[PDB]
């Protein structure tokens, strides 16, 4: 019924979370823009190493090479 | 807007290349493919402080007698991690991007 | 387009070749039918796992990206693909 491109254009301006492949880097922030190669741009992101935080980051560009999934809270 | 054409303007430049295996390669550039398959001459390569696969790749190239001195090495694109240019070269004149200037003039 | 090595791999069809995989398992058998994407099919396959043991498959089909190399027989040392100045007898219109 749905496709990842209308779901991902509608995912803009939401507190989303992105897990990486390494199980020690998870970035949770507000999505700004996303291209057709699915590169991610976030704002006021937070680092999550194995669940626990380390500090706020801000405007950040997450490459689609190292993403595993993106979630909606 | 591929920056391999920036490296095509870097002939006879005495650079270093850190590979993804971990090897630092000091040598002069001769040519580079558009797929970034770069050939180098007057080369010495060194694995710093380990990775036993990188030590095997360092020794099994002939000319070891851990700085290995080799005459001519071609390097594949996906094994290049980063390349360090000499600081005496001016980046403001080599990055003029004449193909991008012609594409902007064609618009 | 295709290139010389994929034409050489398509040349030695129906011959005893030996593959090595990326994991370390070495296969050896008769090539059934090679493709341009190097997804090659072998028959009477003898296999050596990276653990060391030796087994025998009847009909294997390996994907081209998980191949380290493949050994063709030596009589393909002299091939017309290796000729540099072979002219072309009047291609059709």
């Amino acid at each position: 019924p749905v496709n990842p491109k209308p779901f991902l254009k509608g995912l803009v301006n939401h507190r989303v979370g992105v897990k990486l492949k390494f199980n020690s880097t998870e970035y949770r922030g507000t999505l700004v823009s996303t291209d057709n190669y699915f590169n991610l741009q976030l704002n006021e992101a937070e680092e999550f190493v194995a669940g626990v935080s380390h500090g706020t980051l801000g405007e950040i560009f997450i490459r689609c090479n190292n993403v595993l999934y993106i979630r909606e809270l | 807007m591929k920056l391999v054409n920036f490296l095509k303007k870097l002939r006879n430049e005495q650079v270093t290349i850190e590979l993804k295996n971990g090897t630092t390669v000091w040598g002069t550039l001769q040519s580079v493919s558009p797929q970034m398959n770069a050939i180098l001459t007057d080369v010495k390569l060194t694995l710093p402080q380990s990775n036993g696969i990188a030590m095997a790749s360092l020794y099994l190239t002939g000319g070891q007698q851990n700085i290995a001195s080799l005459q001519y090495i071609n390097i594949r694109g996906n094994t290049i991690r980063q390349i360090i240019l000499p600081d005496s070269l001016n980046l403001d004149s080599l990055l003029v991007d004449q193909k991008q200037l012609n594409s902007l003039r064609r618009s | 387009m295709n290139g010389i090595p994929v034409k050489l791999l398509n040349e030695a069809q129906g011959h005893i070749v030996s593959l090595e995989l990326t994991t370390g398992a070495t296969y050896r058998g008769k090539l059934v039918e090679s493709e341009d994407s190097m997804n090659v099919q072998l028959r009477d396959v003898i296999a050596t796992e990276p653990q060391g043991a030796v087994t025998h498959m009847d009909q294997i089909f390996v994907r081209g990206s998980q191949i380290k190399f493949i050994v063709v027989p030596d009589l393909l040392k002299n091939a017309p693909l290796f000729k540099k100045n072979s002219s072309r007898p009047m291609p059709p219109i």
């Binding site: - | 001459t41 099994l60 071609n74 | -």
Partner: protein, 121 residues
């Protein structure tokens, strides 16, 4: 190894040289290239594959090193799991002899085209 590899040569000029090509594992293949492509898939004549064992690696870490050599003959190696290639040994016949051989191949190819034109008539 005092070979003095050419200073401005590429893969079209390095053909029929006894290469010593390195891979990601370090499984070094020694042999003559006879063809390549865009993905750098190299055929290797009289090729040998050499490695070092895990016990020899401790001695290699800072002398003699006992490498393990297997014989592959004429193989065809892919360009994905390779890292670097160098020129180890020069071929048998020289540049002038290869030039005379290439002129003989061109004259033989022109004679073959004249024979095809004679058979077409």
């Amino acid at each position: 190894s005092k070979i003095q590899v050419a200073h401005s040569s590429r893969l079209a000029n390095l053909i029929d040289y006894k290469l010593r090509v390195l891979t990601q594992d370090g499984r070094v293949y020694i042999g003559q290239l006879m063809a390549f492509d865009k993905h750098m898939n190299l055929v290797l004549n009289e090729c040998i594959e050499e490695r070092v064992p895990k016990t020899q690696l401790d001695k290699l870490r800072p002398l003699n090193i006992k490498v393990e050599k297997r014989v592959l003959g004429l193989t065809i190696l892919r360009g994905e799991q390779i890292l670097s290639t160098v020129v180890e040994d020069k071929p048998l016949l020289s540049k002038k002899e290869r030039l005379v051989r290439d002129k003989k191949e061109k004259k033989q190819a022109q004679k073959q085209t004249k024979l095809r034109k004679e058979k077409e008539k």
